[PDB]
Design a protein around this ligand. Sequence first.
Ligand SMILES: Nc1ncnc2c1ncn2[C@@H]1O[C@H](COP(=O)(O)OP(=O)(O)OP(=O)(O)O)[C@@H](O)[C@H]1O
Ligand SMILES: Nc1ncnc2c1ncn2[C@@H]1O[C@H](COP(=O)(O)OP(=O)(O)OP(=O)(O)O)[C@@H](O)[C@H]1O
Ligand SMILES: Nc1ncnc2c1ncn2[C@@H]1O[C@H](COP(=O)(O)OP(=O)(O)OP(=O)(O)O)[C@@H](O)[C@H]1O
Ligand SMILES: Nc1ncnc2c1ncn2[C@@H]1O[C@H](COP(=O)(O)OP(=O)(O)O)[C@@H](O)[C@H]1O
Ligand SMILES: [Mg+2]
Ligand SMILES: [Mg+2]
Ligand SMILES: [Mg+2]
Lengths: 1030, 79, 309, 306
Amino acid sequence: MKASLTFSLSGIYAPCSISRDIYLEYGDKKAECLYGTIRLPQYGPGCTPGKIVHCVLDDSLPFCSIVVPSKLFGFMPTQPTMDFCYFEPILDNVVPVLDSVTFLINEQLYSKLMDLPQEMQQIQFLHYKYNINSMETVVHSRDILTSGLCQILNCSPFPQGLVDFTETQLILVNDTEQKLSALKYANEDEEYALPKIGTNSALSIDLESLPCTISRDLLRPAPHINDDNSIYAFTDAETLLRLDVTSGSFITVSNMGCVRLVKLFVLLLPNGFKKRTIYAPPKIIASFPDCSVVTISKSNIGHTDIPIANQVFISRVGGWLQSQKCFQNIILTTLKKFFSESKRILCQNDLIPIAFDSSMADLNIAEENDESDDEDELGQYYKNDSLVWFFVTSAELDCFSKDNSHFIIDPNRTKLITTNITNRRPLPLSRSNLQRYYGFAETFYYDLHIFPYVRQLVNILETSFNCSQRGITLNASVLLHSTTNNVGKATMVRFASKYLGIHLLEIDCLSLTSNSRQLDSTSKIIGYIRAKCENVLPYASPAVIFLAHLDSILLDVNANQDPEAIKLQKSINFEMSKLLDDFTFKFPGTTFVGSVNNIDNVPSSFRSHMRFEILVPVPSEAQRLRIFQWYLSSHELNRDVQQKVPVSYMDNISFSSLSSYSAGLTPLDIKSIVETARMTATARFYQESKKCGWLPQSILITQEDLSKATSKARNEFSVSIGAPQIPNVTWDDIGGIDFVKGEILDTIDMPLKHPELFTSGMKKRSGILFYGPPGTGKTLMAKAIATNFSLNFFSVKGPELLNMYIGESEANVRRVFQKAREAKPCVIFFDQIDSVAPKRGNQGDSGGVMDRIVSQLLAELDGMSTDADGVFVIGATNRPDLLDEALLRPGRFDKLLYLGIPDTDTKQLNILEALTRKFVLDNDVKLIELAKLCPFNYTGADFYALCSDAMLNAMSRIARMVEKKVSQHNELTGENISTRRWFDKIATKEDTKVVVKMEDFLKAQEQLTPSVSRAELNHYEAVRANFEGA
Amino acid sequence: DVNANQDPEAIKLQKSINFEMSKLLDDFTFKFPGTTFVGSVNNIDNVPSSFRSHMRFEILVPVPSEAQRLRIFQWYLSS
Amino acid sequence: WCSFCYWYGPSLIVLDNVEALFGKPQANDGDPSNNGQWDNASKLLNFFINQVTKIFNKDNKRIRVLFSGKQKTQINPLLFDKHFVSETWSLRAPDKHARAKLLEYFFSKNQIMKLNRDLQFSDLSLETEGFSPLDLEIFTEKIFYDLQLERDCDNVVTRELFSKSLSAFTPSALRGVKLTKETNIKWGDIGALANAKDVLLETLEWPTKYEPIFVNCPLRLRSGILLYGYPGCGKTLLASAVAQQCGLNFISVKGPEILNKFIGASEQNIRELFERAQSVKPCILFFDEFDSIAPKRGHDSTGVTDRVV
Amino acid sequence: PTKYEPIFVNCPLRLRSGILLYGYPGCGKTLLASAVAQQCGLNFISVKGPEILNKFIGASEQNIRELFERAQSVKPCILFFDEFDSIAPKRGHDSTGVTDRVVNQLLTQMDGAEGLDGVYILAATSRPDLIDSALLRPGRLDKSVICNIPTESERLDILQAIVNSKDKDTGQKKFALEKNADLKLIAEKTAGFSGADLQGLCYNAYLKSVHRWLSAADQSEVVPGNDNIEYFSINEHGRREENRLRLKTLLQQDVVHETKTSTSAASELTAVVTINDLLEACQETKPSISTSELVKLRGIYDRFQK
Ligand SMILES: Nc1ncnc2c1ncn2[C@@H]1O[C@H](COP(=O)(O)OP(=O)(O)OP(=O)(O)O)[C@@H](O)[C@H]1O
Ligand SMILES: Nc1ncnc2c1ncn2[C@@H]1O[C@H](COP(=O)(O)OP(=O)(O)OP(=O)(O)O)[C@@H](O)[C@H]1O
Ligand SMILES: Nc1ncnc2c1ncn2[C@@H]1O[C@H](COP(=O)(O)OP(=O)(O)OP(=O)(O)O)[C@@H](O)[C@H]1O
Ligand SMILES: Nc1ncnc2c1ncn2[C@@H]1O[C@H](COP(=O)(O)OP(=O)(O)O)[C@@H](O)[C@H]1O
Ligand SMILES: [Mg+2]
Ligand SMILES: [Mg+2]
Ligand SMILES: [Mg+2]
């Protein structure tokens, strides 16, 4: 619903008011305290989640008018009161009570209240001081309640809801740090004077581009539609009066050259943008490079000074999409539309931006204009995505002169005339976003503090620019390459281009209209390449040529060569060399920026004449933080989606948790994970919508399913490379390994974490070797490692390496072991090394292949100089005497850790409870009783056998109970039934938990026996007593 | 058959011929009621199942045996 | 396609037999022009991916794409590496209850054969176990034809005339020419003794007779049996009969096959046969002669026995 | 060629062509072989493991021939054999059943007729007694430098060299060495059996230093004064400290840049090593008894007439 708005003098805790008329259109005598909902119009991508408000009925309010407290939002009634909003009546007033709320309070009043020992005295103080009353009051997660004093610190999990101390814990927090001195809500403070604040004859303030779009329906005044269009300006404070001419006035002042008239407005009261500023759309700032302090004065004029300029001679800027047949038609048609649909003043030495959707493309539309009425389309469907600049160029003025700023084109008295092209340089992104204003496809914002390769390339382009702005032409060029796929090669070049205000061509080679086709048309392809490039350079500003996937066309010699294969190869190398070097003289300062996928595959000649080299890696954890910070941002979710209900994160999200758990993933995977989370949350939202329900105002992402999606991301990685997946084994699914978990965390966690303070010494502990009797978890530890940590889990299953032919090692072990270097940080798991690496001194006949494996394995493994790429090799053995001197304590695999028969007293209990994870037992038979009833010398996995066959007899009990119950059924109803119909017509839920009460334990203790006897233990205890030779 | 040994272009020629043959085989059943089709093959494996599914019957014809041969000689030596 | 779908609003594109327009060229072994270079197929694909992606980031609702193909891994892996996919519905098989309703629909499809004497298809499923919907179409038509001449009268299906068809028609479209012989001993044909068949059955059928009970208890599925074998008799019968539970996909291996004296004998045999066991739906697998296969080398002998062990 | 080139104007004998190292331990001189590159400025090219061998019978000699082609092309380089034992055992009637011909290709080209490559043969191997008289000869490869355990003060010397821990001209004692350098106790209370053992011992003692540092650091603040005790007269539910994480994760939001520190042991937040932390691991220093290998060494040292 539309509603009119007004701000009351504010009690903050005082209710809003509901008008009698809305209390008739949605009148309900059972609910006179009608809880309203309001949407607050604002600057921003969309209206932030609306507020539930507690209200009192008022009959005095005019039609659809509503009043809310001012200072409840930190604004004061001295500021311009917004006259409208939107309202929603809450269906049946259905609202949940909050599960938890926390408050922050200053240490003085905190202690003054905590001095009261009787908690109810503080509860009454909530009433006496704050006039809070339960069930009446609704509270909101973070709202400051009084400057310097009380604040709500959180509501959880809901952002809003009812309160009652009968369920709401009312947590309090002490502001020891006095930040409440800074955390004051008051958006305005009274200035010491309005005079002497500059002089009304001349003010100087930094201009800024408005960080968002703004539209004719939000502004307070009422411009016309056909004229007054497009050009507007926005001001922040009593500055609106320091100009002597109020909001709604024109001003025209500029720092240099011609004047530029603009309509100036006060900002809407609900604004987040920093004051002491004059905000503008990109349209204005585009004409005024740097010089951010702008001259300002009253500068008023009596309406439009010039009513006609009888012809205009506009020109397009050069630039990538501005010079293609497939865009030409859409360009001219959108130009015609734009200029036809409204009347505007224009001036020489000025730019006009035009925006359109490049998807419209090869759709012509046959009848919408020129033979049809002026208002023609809903751009809701005829979208926008790409932007162009037209220079206004010359215009035919009348006898009047010099005041060119008012030129205007009557749609019948005047025409627009093409002059082919002009040259001008775009704004520097550092001062102003275009993209975030138009909402286009985004270009992620790096910062040179933490991306070394960006600092590199940006410095290269910066010098290539400025050195040739000075007298020294630079032929700078660079190639980007990477070890992995999918690192953001193009993104870097684009970002740099915007960050430096540098033009670019964007070209991809894959889309060339022919392959490396056998019949020679390398001429045709390289010709099309140059012919497409050259067209803009005659009017290019300083610019770069970016070539995507050079590897597709710079093939390289020798696999099996046709004569034509040689001719194509050499022809391509030659013509590319010529093309590039020629460009370096055809135009100065114009930089070739290539990209490639396998640096081994680029041909040697090109590899020599190329200049700089940059290797861009898979990002660090420190970088991951900023990656999530981007794609989880408000704008970066809100763009994609139609429905007016917005989305957000919960402020609980642990960026540490994501950055650690997402280790090794590439940026493109981080997008995948976040967008999957968005999907799952929306599915939850529509599941909620099945009932009248709660939380309808907005779905948020939450830490649980955002965590979960990592597992899918890792499996979809694994199916690309390294197909094996692993069943989950969470940390608590093992126990009774305390020393071993100690050392494993001392090896894989603490040296891996905290390199800000761990020196990351020049060598590292390579691995872990588990040895001992079978059935002591030494397999399970590996599946646990694969489950809980972010590490990937490559492995070979024992003698998976050996193979039929001679020369076994390159057929497997080399390819896999180097693949682990090729992968991101990942373990290699081994089992049965006593089978894979026989002690070389036990020489073998019949080709001695054990010597071949063992030699290659040591050579690929050890030494590890310049090679500490996290390649932890971890594994298990039965009997370590058969291990080679591969185990000799160089630290190449020699982190020996034993596992064995547990301590008698309670570690068997820790075993039983761990294996009882997600098991069920629900009586007075505490696990202490089981752990005492079991005799000793049973060990490890044999207790899993004891649970296994206890479970088997428990399900047997249930199966025979079912057999009885189904027999007694069939005797009385369903005389001809057996299975599917039976199970589909029973509906058990008390029985279906099928909990064992007891007795299955006792008959397990009768039926089970230790799987290795002491006479078997002695054979292991011997090697145990070798201590591997100590 | 279709095999790794041959050009996928030629294999798509085979595909085209197979498909159009199967369609014409049914098209006779549309245009020309009561048509019946007899195929003959010297080695059953070489026709892919893509065609063999559009059988209604098949017959293994063996080499003749003694009683047949006695009849067949009688034919050739009849006057 | 892209432009039209963009103009017609919320839309879905169907692409079928994707291998021809976007399949990898047979994933050929050896990499001439294939190590660092792409076939033209991928060069189509990447163009399509980019263009639709620059649509998709404008409006999550505007366009979606549906690929139908043979097997998720077999398509060009580039389709995975850019995270284009997000699903994997695989039409694994027909199943017992539905296949009857399906078969009835085929029977009533056209040239109406007007059903059958006495039965209602449920038992008639018995031989169709591995068949597929097109297979049941073909089989239905075959049954109709080979009815319509063997009686001079028309519509009456009879148990025996139906049964004699499956003895040889063998649609078996996924099975090549022929891949079975053993049909001797049924599950209810208890040659020898039941003496501990109790436990074999208790391991066998309960996951298909009490099915959801196992799900609610986090056991690892208890299995694994050694027969005592003292007379050098028994299992050859017993295991074959247990396989004739028919709720399974039996595969044959015998011990003294694998002891090739080439060094690699364990690889390309044991791993081969267990990948085969992954290729089938999970099933019993037979072994025998463990006195050969698994002597307790005890770290004393360490022979080639251990390299298979 | 970098010190005697004014002398070697024309040495009338061809210059010595190579060096095989051996040790009864794992060859610590593998590190030496890796180091002499940067220590001398020459290029380095390595036969890691057996990688000359191949499946195809035609490929083995083509491979090693192309190896020596590469070497003779990269005129100033060291050509390294990572484990000569892998490929050059004693000749016989196909004791390698196939492709053993590689050993004859090597014997042919180790000096052949060209003699001085300018490249030199470098190799390492434990158990070189499997190599044979057919290949070790002074007119061929010969120099046979033995390595042995660093007895007595050589333990101290190698310890001092590692604990100096100097690199990158920065953090120049990267291991925070013990302030007194009281090594003369520690180095012989430790029985040393290699060098990598001594390095591992010192590294693990650094890790223990980090442990005592990291576990003390927060509690050392907490003992004189706790923090974040946001008591509120809690009631109904015992969240009194379970709330602490959901508090801390919101209650702290500061950010800082260009942080500095000084009370750490001469590097940011680092923990000094200390003699007790080494001495406690004197029993953690584990042997791997194999002294019979010295009797295996006694073969070649008996071939040594000295
Ligand atoms: N750091 C990043 N920030 C934002 N988006 C990123 C980042 N890295 C990658 N992307 C996204 O992934 C894509 C990067 O495309 P780009 O051309 O750089 O590489 P690619 O196509 O993955 O790889 P290649 O050219 O090697 O085949 C874009 O969709 C971009 O939005
Ligand atoms: N906390 C635990 N401690 C010990 N055993 C456990 C624990 N949790 C589960 N187990 C059992 O231990 C088994 C793994 O034991 P282990 O890896 O030592 O033996 P194995 O895999 O049969 O043999 P091998 O180690 O020779 O490959 C698990 O399958 C499980 O039954
Ligand atoms: N005299 C020495 N004897 C043994 N090891 C040493 C010696 N000096 C240094 N080291 C250790 O050698 C390690 C480097 O590995 P290196 O290849 O040199 O030896 P190794 O692993 O024992 O030999 P191998 O390659 O023959 O198996 C370092 O950790 C270093 O501490
Ligand atoms: N019910 C039965 N009782 C006893 N022996 C049987 C029975 N059925 C088959 N046999 C015989 O047992 C053998 C079948 O293999 P099997 O008993 O498993 O011996 P093996 O253990 O050597 O394979 C054949 O000699 C077969 O004739
Ligand atoms: Mg790319
Ligand atoms: Mg195990
Ligand atoms: Mg070594």
